[PDB]
Design a protein around this nucleic acid. Structure first.
Ligand SMILES: Nc1ccn([C@@H]2O[C@H](COP(=O)(O)OP(=O)(O)OP(=O)(O)O)[C@@H](O)[C@H]2O)c(=O)n1
Length: 580
DNA sequence: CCTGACTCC
DNA sequence: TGGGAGTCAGG
């Protein structure tokens, strides 16, 4: 553990070589407008630490950072790029990102620092970030000599690990997935995060004030029905009211006590009117806590924008996640919640929000991968796929499919994608479990290609130890041969689902790259704001809507070619709510 | 820090 | 006994 480096007082020419490992260290977990605490550069000429005050005000270093022909290898380049944007500096030329490389090789390792990636290649000459900075309230930037050594060791690690990681990605046929998909996407995500989304705070606050009144009213109605005050947001207390005081039946337990999940409570609605009120209260309360108060807490006051962070190296299937705030779970299903979307507005006057979503992409991907003739033909003629499944299960003509039938069929269609059991299906639909079991049997009789896919993908996972997606993403399933039924069954359902969910993730990621390319080449002001798994949200001048109406669905539908068409719906309006 | 609730795909 | 996520208040 001995590594020479230079603690530089000024930028020199030899630090500005055309290939380098670069560390631009941002310790705060939310890197938006966060301090850069230090810089390290490792290249052919040596190893260098620079203070940000020095490096970031030096016009040659700033020029080097922005020169796309000066190639940098980094870990979590999006963090660095966004933090630099907040400092008014452009980062270009990032040719290798070790975080994204590690994520593709095995998402289950949970790699979130250089040391963790380094462990995948038995490289030990660098410490974990948590050991250097500490945890929680103890977290602190260490004295310069200690900080400098750490950043330089991180850079040296990236320098030495690039080739071993690329070589393994190449053997896995994942190098193009890194270089042509994830790395270009990282730049697009950086742009989206830094742009942010504008919030109508006057409207949100008015909503909040009216919501608080309604919440108080339901709260009092609940105490009156219970005949007593209690904390409705406490599982223990509520459980005592429902199952001991009011003596309602106990339908389900958790390891800590009585379940009061919405699924459970809905089944108790007929017994006592306190239960519907409790469900309503908890709905309103989550709107208040999360989508009014929580959201206002993260609005940047001077610009009224929120700036999410899209975690690109977290989910086990290749999806993104969205944090602080999560803009991928804004309410839409109930009108009361959906109104929250009225607060999300374009960032300029006379601009509009444009929202485009894939129609049933998971089931279309299933049709493709399973090569199920019945499912394929249905999508080829754009027959509503819930109606189709109802026809086959109930053995009725399309005209005989009743609203309840299509509802049962829709539950089956998605259930299948998750490996649902007859129990889960019966619980979800509130039908006899015998009936549910018959639905699943009939489904697999009607879609034999899907049945074979479910059988075969489990066999593949057991033989290989992992499953793949269309663009060669992997998920390892080391528990798939467990002798324990619960453990094994969960892994089997992951095997069934991951190629579907993950291939859908691959597709929309490629679509984002293709769409950005078309937007930039056409010099449109339109730009991406958000991705929500199977949908993309943009804003643009109202004059550009006619163009987007053609461009956005076409690019999304053509991103990949499957054995069935892809179909995209789209809407636009003056707020996100109105983009429907 | 975990649990269980609500929110989305 | 339904796949993937994040935030919240209370435990
Ligand atoms: N060396 C390779 C080859 C293929 N792929 C991935 O697998 C997809 C399709 O592979 P192909 O062999 O061309 O069929 C590519 O688009 C890419 O995402 C890759 O990442 N690296």
């Amino acid at each position: 553990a001995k590594m020479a480096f230079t603690l530089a007082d000024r930028v020199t020419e030899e630090m500005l070589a055309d290939k380098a490992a670069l560390v631009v260290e941002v310790v705060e977990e939310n890197y938006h407008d966060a301090p850069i605490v230090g810089i390290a550069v490792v290249n052919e000429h040596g190893r260098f630490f620079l203070r940000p005050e020095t490096a970031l005000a030096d016009p040659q270093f700033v020029a080097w950072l922005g020169d796309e022909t000066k190639k940098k290898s980094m870990f979590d380049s999006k963090r660095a790029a966004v933090a630099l944007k907040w400092k008014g500096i452009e980062l270009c030329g990032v040719s290798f990102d070790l975080l994204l490389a590690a994520y593709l090789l095995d998402p289950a390792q949970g790699v979130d620092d250089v040391a963790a990636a380094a462990k995948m290649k038995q490289y030990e000459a660098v410490r974990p970030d948590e050991a250097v900075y500490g945890k929680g309230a103890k977290r602190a930037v260490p004295d310069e000599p200690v900080l400098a050594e750490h950043l330089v060791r991180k850079a040296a690690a990236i320098w030495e690990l690039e080739r071993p990681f690329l070589d393994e990605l190449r053997r896995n046929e994942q190098d193009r997935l890194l270089v042509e998909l994830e790395q270009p996407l990282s730049s697009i995500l950086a742009e989206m995060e830094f742009a942010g989304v504008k919030v109508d705070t006057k409207r949100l606050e008015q909503m909040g004030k009216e919501l608080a009144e309604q919440l108080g009213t339901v709260e009092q109605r609940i105490y009156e029905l219970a005949g007593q005050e209690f904390n409705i947001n406490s599982p223990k207390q509520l459980g005592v009211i429902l199952f001991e005081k009011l003596q309602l039946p106990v339908l389900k337990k958790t390891k800590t006590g009585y379940s009061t999940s919405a699924d459970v409570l809905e089944k108790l609605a007929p017994y006592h009117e306190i239960v519907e009120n409790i469900l309503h209260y908890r709905q309103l309360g989550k709107l208040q806590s999360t989508y009014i108060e929580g959201l206002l807490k993260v609005v940047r006051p001077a610009t009224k924008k929120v700036h999410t962070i899209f975690n690109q190296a977290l989910t086990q299937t290749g999806r993104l996640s969205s944090t602080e705030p999560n803009l991928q779970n804004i309410p839409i299903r109930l009108e009361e919640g959906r109104k929250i979307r009225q607060a999300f507005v374009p960032s300029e006057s006379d601009w509009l929000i444009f929202a485009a979503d894939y129609s049933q992409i998971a089931l279309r991907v299933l049709a493709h991968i399973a090569e199920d003739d019945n499912l394929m033909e249905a999508f080829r003629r754009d027959l509503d796929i819930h109606t189709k499944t109802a026809m086959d299960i109930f053995q009725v003509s399309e005209d005989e499919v009743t609203p309840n039938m299509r509802r049962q069929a829709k539950a089956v269609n998605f259930g299948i994608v998750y490996g649902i059991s007859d129990y889960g299906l019966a619980q979800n639909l509130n039908i006899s479990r015998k009936e549910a079991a018959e639905f699943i049997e009939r489904y697999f009789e009607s879609f034999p290609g899907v049945k074979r896919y479910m059988e075969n993908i489990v066999q593949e996972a057991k033989q290989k130890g992992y499953v793949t997606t269309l663009l060669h993403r992997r998920r390892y399933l080391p528990d798939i041969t467990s002798r324990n039924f619960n453990v094994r069954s969960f892994a089997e359902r992951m095997a069934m689902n991951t190629p579907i969910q993950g291939s859908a993730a691959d597709i929309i990621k490629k679509a984002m790259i293709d769409l950005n390319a078309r937007l930039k080449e056409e010099r449109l002001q339109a730009h991406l704001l958000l991705q929500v798994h199977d949908e993309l949200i943009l804003e643009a001048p109202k004059e550009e809507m006619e163009r987007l109406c053609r461009l956005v669905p076409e690019v999304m539908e053509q991103a990949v070619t499957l054995r069935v068409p892809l179909k995209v719906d789209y809407h636009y309006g003056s707020t996100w709510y109105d983009a429907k």
